[PDB]
Structures are given as structure tokens and as C-alpha cells.
Amino acid sequence: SVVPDLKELVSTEAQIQKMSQDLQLEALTIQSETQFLTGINSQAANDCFK
Amino acid sequence: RGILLLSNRLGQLVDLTRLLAYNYETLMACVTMNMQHVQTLTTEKLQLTSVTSLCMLIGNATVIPSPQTLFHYYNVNVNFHSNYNERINDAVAIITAANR
Amino acid sequence: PKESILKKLEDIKPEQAKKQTKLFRIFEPRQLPIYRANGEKELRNRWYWKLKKDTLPDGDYDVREYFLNLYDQVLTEMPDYLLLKDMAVENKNSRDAGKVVDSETASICDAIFQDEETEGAVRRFIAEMRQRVQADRNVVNYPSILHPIDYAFNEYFLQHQLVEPLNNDIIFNYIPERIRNDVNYILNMDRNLPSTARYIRPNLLQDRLNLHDNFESLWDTITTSNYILARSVVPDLKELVSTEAQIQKMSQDLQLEALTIQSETQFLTGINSQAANDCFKTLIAAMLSQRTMSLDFVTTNYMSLISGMWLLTVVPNDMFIRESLVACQLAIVNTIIYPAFGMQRMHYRNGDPQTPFQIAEQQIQNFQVANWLHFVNNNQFRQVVIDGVLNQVLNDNIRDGHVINQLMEALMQLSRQQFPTMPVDYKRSIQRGILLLSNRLGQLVDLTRLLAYNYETLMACVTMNMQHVQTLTTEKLQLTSVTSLCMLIGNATVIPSPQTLFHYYNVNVNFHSNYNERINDAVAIITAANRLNLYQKKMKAIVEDFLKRLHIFDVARVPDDQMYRLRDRLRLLPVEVRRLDIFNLILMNMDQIERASDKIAQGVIIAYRDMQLERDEMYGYVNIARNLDGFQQINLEELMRTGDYAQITNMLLNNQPVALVGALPFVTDSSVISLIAKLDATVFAQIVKLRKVDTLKPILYKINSDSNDFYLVANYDWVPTSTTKVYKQVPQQFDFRNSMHMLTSNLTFTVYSDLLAFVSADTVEPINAVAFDNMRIMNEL
């Protein structure tokens, strides 16, 4: 109830996108799309923080 | 490659440390109840999901506890305490009487 | 899109000949009444200096930032060179025309030359004040009036003119030191440059940013770019065995049938009148740009593999990604060489990492086979530096470059494994494909030559010191096309059109120039940004613009991170004389500017004790101290920052002699009264109520019993008692005679852009071209 909410974050989309460029996601490895359920960060961080 | 994203950002990750450092170190100040470290019976789920986000995802942001906010906090624990202590007395008093 | 990142490239015109007109001044002289001690207006009036545009703000911080913008403005207007023929004007007076410099200069003269000035000496001077030319040196002499600070500027602008000469020889010299030398080409020009030539210098220092260490993301984007650029060049192949014909004899040599399949899967290789051109281009750029590609094969198409061996013998494996060389080799090793060389036994078991070609080397014996292995395996790029200036070219092992005893050996080794075996038939289909390389080997010898040259040619014109890392977008290449190019070529001889080559140079050039330039533009700012304590102009700012100015990069689509790290490196970078040399100038006088000009002050004192006032001429005599000698202080900037510790609050409450400092709003009053009433002590109270101040408008008392309808007091006899004066220097006065300076420049210039164009480039007949060995490239009928 107290822990101040955060502000000025990096656009969700922007980062995750440079992320795929860097991440080399789908490169053989079978167990895809489990590292990107990361999203809702604009939230997740606030939650993780509090 | 992933590791690097921690590193570059590291210049900022720093910022995180400072943040908490302060906040906890601040808020805390206004707690009357003592607090011995105990192995609670219950947990609290923390998805590395969010964690990871906070991490590479924080900019030159800077937030802290609103004055008014802080007090409100003190105030509460306070009352609570007062009640605990008080009832305690109210309690004891009776019980002892109850005996003689 | 494919050719949507190319229009963002060829459309980059960084070559901008920056020039100027208006002489850069900041303060125009102006009128104002004279107030002799005693305070009367003695008439005649005098001329002083006040700034054009008092913009200056409230708050030391806002001030500092303001100047900063000036720096940005200075640079964007930074005169790349000068010339005054274009600055003419006419003196209304003098021994004659006179032609002076800049309208303002003119005005002023005519002006003073009427309003009863200091007489003679002035009018006089204004007269025998003119121009004069010393043709013999191209020099020019023009008179000009400015201000110590003005001569200051304009001066250096003259003593630096980033414009050198330009003789035939220099043009010749800017044509890559390995092309003028390459025989196969010729050059010729249609004109003889005048002694009046000039040329700008596209500067191209190295990646002062080592954009490859950690930033991979960006390299990939560069490579890509540099790559497309290359294809745009890569010559389009010529005449090669009509598709149908070859593929037809192809079916023959092998012996086909009905449900008896073998070689049949080695023909989705047909299309080459598309594949060969693609495979060809693709290969070069890859190298040049230095991009890393992948591999799309099939385990049933062995032919497609054979050709692989063609490839691999070439491009030093490191050029291909890891997981690709891995597949490839093992596929060869386990289905082509062991399996029909009675060496099967163990169909070769490999379980990831270490090197699979390699290990086959130290395993089986056979010389022919054995040389291939070492030459291929340990084959790499020759990390070469200088090439007629820090080109830093990754080169191809002399050997390969046409001294293709590689190909001949690659074939001899193939001519000798086709001896032993195991699964009866299988050998039929495999060795038959192998032979198709051998007959063609007369021509294969060629393909090598081609690339050899091309890459080795195009090369030179890449000031962008390319290196050797790992891409991350991995361009895709099929053994399909490869295989096509291979058997389907010969007789032909192709080469880089002149015009083509230049165009290439030109681009990288600009680009470079931009990179280097923005870099300087970048640095300059940042450093300035520091000796200014702007703890609030959060830099996420500069980086952004920077990147943008070199289109290609989708700014919004790139995180804050990398960006900072980008600053971290920039910070350690030296500025450039030009850039630097100017900032030193702005600061050095900074003070002087601020102090002068109205709308602002500096600070105020509060001595709770009656006291005198200076008797300056400009203003009547008022509340001013140019020293604040003694008393204490308190930076306001740090105050409203820190949050005020009632330190001030207390002193104000208790009344103690004190001073204040920083940007401030002055306020002029008249009716003496105000003073006797001591109004000036009021104002302060406020603060007490509001921790912060800006609502603080201090007071000044312009007192000249002349214009102050309340002279009633100047009467008796007096002498100005005040409590609290103001920190603010005094607008200097104007000494014309000296105020003027003299100027030098040049007459009739001749600036040129682009260059090159001045040459008609021709080419020898294809049939007899030459490589770095003086041998006819393409000598197999």
C-alpha cells in the first residue's frame, strides 16, 4: 500500500524487440516462447518491486 | 548475448541498488514493532518474469515516498501497537484479578 | 523492404558547403542620456553597448543551459569558409565609395555622423576610411566596426578556413592508391585547374567508437547495410551455357531411368540465370561488408555438396557461421568421403563442439586428400592494415587469389578417392557427379579468378575499416545456387564498371564524413555539457539526435541502455581544435555578457546601514556595487536546490549584513520618495513565508533629479542614503576610433564539391584482364 509506484520505463515493445535481434530466439532449441511470457512488465516490475 | 544486456544496462542497474537501498532504509525508520527474522509458514510467489523486467527495463526514473505517505505509515503501526500493548494490559489485569 | 534501406543510403548527402553572410555580432551600440555628477542631463547624449536580445533567464541554472544552446547555434552556423566580395556595402562618406563590411557598420556611421558627436576626429576618421586590394596575392582589405568581443569571433573564422588548395595532382591522389596502379584500367581528364581551386576535406578517422565491442545489435545493422550497398555494385554476369543445354547433357552423363533414382535431386540447381548472379553477388558483399551467412542444403543432393568443397576451399570458413560449417563438413565427411572410400567402418560419430573437418585430417591417410584438409581447415584471412591509408582490409590468402593451385589440387584429390568402395552402386551416382566438376575444372579455375579480382578490387574503396565479427541476421545462401554457378560458367570475363566503382567510394566516404563529423558535434556538446554542471539536462538527449542523423537506425526502436554506454565511450573523446577553440572563447568572456544587458542583475546586498551610491554617468547615481567586498554569501542556485535550511530564514529574521548570488530580476523606481521611505527593505520579508524565492524582485533607484519629478530634494543639497545596493557591472561605453578593427580575407574563390567526375574512365577488352599476378584472368576456352 505504501511502496511508491515507479515511473518513466522503457516502452515494453521497444526493448523486447531489440531483444529478439540480440536473443536469437528460434534457433533450433525446442521449448520456444517461454522466455517471453516476460511481458506485462509495465506491471511485472511494479509488482516485483513492491 | 543475454548476459551483455545486463552489463550495458549495468550502468543503470546501479540505479536500482541505490533505489531500494534508500527506500527500504527510509520507510523502515518509521516502524515501532520490532522484527525478528522468522521462517514464516507461508511463502510469496515471485516470478523471475517481473524481476527480469525491472532489471534491464528501468531508466533514469527516480521516485520516493510522499511525505504524507510516510506519516500515514507511522500512524498506523503506532495505533496498532498502542492497541496491542493496551489490550495486553486490559487482558493481564483481568486474568490476575480472576485468580485472587 | 529490400531497396528501402538503399534509398536511405544513396540519398545521404552529408557534403554541405557551409558559408555565411551577416557578420556575427551580439551587441549593437545605442543612445541614452548623460548624467554628470549632480544628476542633470547635460545634453549631447552618449553612445554605449547593450545586447541585441536580453533573453537571459531567472536562475543560475537556466542561464547556464541558455548559453549552451548558443554553442549548438554556433556550430550549425559554423562558417565552413569565408569571402567578403559578397559582403560589400557603401560608405555614405569618405575619399570615395569605400565599400565597408555589413549594413550595421554603415548605419552606425551615418548615424553618429549627424547627431552632434565628439566632432572632428570622428567625422574625419569615418572619412578616409576604406577598402584597398592587393590583387597580386588575392588578398582583400575591408574596414569593419564591431566590438572587442566581435573582432574576437570573426577573426578566428578567418584564421582557420577549412579549405585547402586543389591541383590536378591532388585529384589524382584522391583516387585509391591501388586503382590508379591497377593496370586493366585507364583514366583521363578534360580540364586544367586554376590556381584558384579549393576543396574541403572529407575527414575519415576510424570507428573512434569501436562499434563492435558489445553493441553487436548495431554492427548487424551496419553489415546488412554495407552488404546491400555491395550488391548494388557487384557486376552482373555475362553469357553462360544456356540453362537448358547444360542441364540436358547433365541427365545424360549420369544415366537415368524409371524409379531408379540417384543424381535426380541435383537439379533443383537449374535456375542460375538467377542463381549464379545471386550466388556471385551475394558472395562478394558478404566478404566486403563482412556479413555472416547460413546454409540451406539437403542430405540427398550430394552434387550440391561437391560444389560446397568449391566454396569452402575459398571463403575462410570463419566467414560462415558456426552451426553451418558444422553441418556441412560432417555431412561431407559422413556421406561422401568415408562411405565410398572403404573408410566407413564407423559412419563417423560426432556430438557437437570441437572441429569436425579438422579431426578427419589427423585420421585418414592419403596425400592428395591430406593437403586439402590442412589448407582448408587452417585457412584464414590475412589481417592486413595500411593500403594507401588505414583501410584495414581483411584479405584473402595470396595463394587462392588466382594462384588457384588450390582448385587444381581440389580436383586432383577428387580424381583419386574415386578408387575404393563398399555399397556397390551408390558409388555410381557419387563419382559421376564428381566428374562433372573435373571436366568443368578448366572453367572452375575461372570462378575463383572472378571473385578473386572483384572482391580484391571493390575492396580499396571502403574507408570503413571492416573487421571480422559475427553478424546476427545471417544472410541465407543455398547450395542450390552455389552448385549452379559452379558447373555452369566459363569463357566469360566480367568487371566493375568505372562509374560503378566511384559511386561506391563516394558513398562510404560521405557516410564516414558524417560519422566522424557527428562524433565531433557530439563530443563537443557533451564536454561543454559538463563544465556547466547541468545536472538536469539528462543526457538521453544527445545520443538520440546523434544516431538519427545517420539514418537507417530506427531510433524509437532502440532502448535507453546501449545509448548510455555510447556516452560512456564518447566522454573519453577529444574535441577538435575548431570546436574546442570556440568554446574557450564563449566562456572566457561569458561573465562580461551576463553582467551587461538589462532584465537581469547578479545578486543583492542587505547592509542594515545607511550608505552612499556611485555617481556613474549612464545611470544617474544609484544602488550599485561591482565588488560585494566583504559581507557573506549564499548561492541561490544551491539554495532552491538544497531546500533552504532556515539559514537564510534565520538571518533574515535576526537582521544581519548579507549577500545573495545568481540570476535576478531587477526593478527600476524613480520618485525619490520611495527611497527615503526605504521601500527596498520590504521585498525581503516574503521569503520567510515561501522557503523558495524567485518572487524576489530587488530594487534599483535610477536617480537623476532631472527625469525624477521629485528633484525637490536634489535641491537643498544631499547625497543618496540607501540600505542595500545591487551586484551588476556597468555597460561599458563606446570609443569608436578604437572600437573599429580591420579585416583580411580573400577574393574570387572557387569551391568545388564531389570532384571525381572530372574523369572519363574506360576499360580494356574483357578477354585479357589481369590480377595481382599479371596473368590473363579467364584463359580457358
From Swiss-Prot, chain C:
<dbReference type="InterPro" id="IPR007779">
    <property type="entry name" value="Rotavirus_VP2"/>
</dbReference>
<feature type="site" description="Interaction with the intermediate capsid protein VP6">
    <location>
        <position position="742"/>
    </location>
</feature>
<feature type="site" description="Interaction with the intermediate capsid protein VP6">
    <location>
        <position position="129"/>
    </location>
</feature>
<dbReference type="Pfam" id="PF05087">
    <property type="entry name" value="Rota_VP2"/>
</dbReference>
<comment type="function">
    <text>Inner capsid protein that self-assembles to form an icosahedral capsid with a T=2 symmetry, which consists of 120 copies of VP2, with channels at each of its five-fold vertices. This capsid constitutes the innermost concentric layer of the viral mature particle. It encapsidates the polymerase VP1, the capping enzyme VP3 and the genomic dsRNA, thereby defining the core.</text>
</comment>
<keyword id="KW-1153">Inner capsid protein</keyword>
<feature type="site" description="Interaction with the intermediate capsid protein VP6">
    <location>
        <position position="125"/>
    </location>
</feature>
<dbReference type="GO" id="GO:0019013">
    <property type="term" value="C:viral nucleocapsid"/>
</dbReference>
<dbReference type="GO" id="GO:0039616">
    <property type="term" value="C:T=2 icosahedral viral capsid"/>
</dbReference>
<keyword id="KW-1141">T=2 icosahedral capsid protein</keyword>
<feature type="site" description="Interaction with the intermediate capsid protein VP6">
    <location>
        <position position="740"/>
    </location>
</feature>
<keyword id="KW-0946">Virion</keyword>
<comment type="subunit">
    <text>Homodecamer; each decamer is made up of two conformers of VP2, called VP2A and VP2B. Interacts with a VP1-VP3 complex. Interacts with the intermediate capsid protein VP6. Interacts with NSP5. Interacts (via N-terminus) with NSP2.</text>
</comment>
<dbReference type="GO" id="GO:0003723">
    <property type="term" value="F:RNA binding"/>
</dbReference>
<dbReference type="GO" id="GO:0039625">
    <property type="term" value="C:viral inner capsid"/>
</dbReference>
<feature type="site" description="Interaction with the intermediate capsid protein VP6">
    <location>
        <position position="121"/>
    </location>
</feature>
<keyword id="KW-0832">Ubl conjugation</keyword>
<keyword id="KW-0677">Repeat</keyword>
<keyword id="KW-0694">RNA-binding</keyword>
<keyword id="KW-0167">Capsid protein</keyword>
<feature type="region of interest" description="Hydrophobic">
    <location>
        <begin position="323"/>
        <end position="343"/>
    </location>
</feature>
<comment type="similarity">
    <text>Belongs to the rotavirus VP2 family.</text>
</comment>
<protein>
    <recommendedName>
        <fullName>Inner capsid protein VP2</fullName>
    </recommendedName>
</protein>
<feature type="region of interest" description="Hydrophobic">
    <location>
        <begin position="295"/>
        <end position="315"/>
    </location>
</feature>
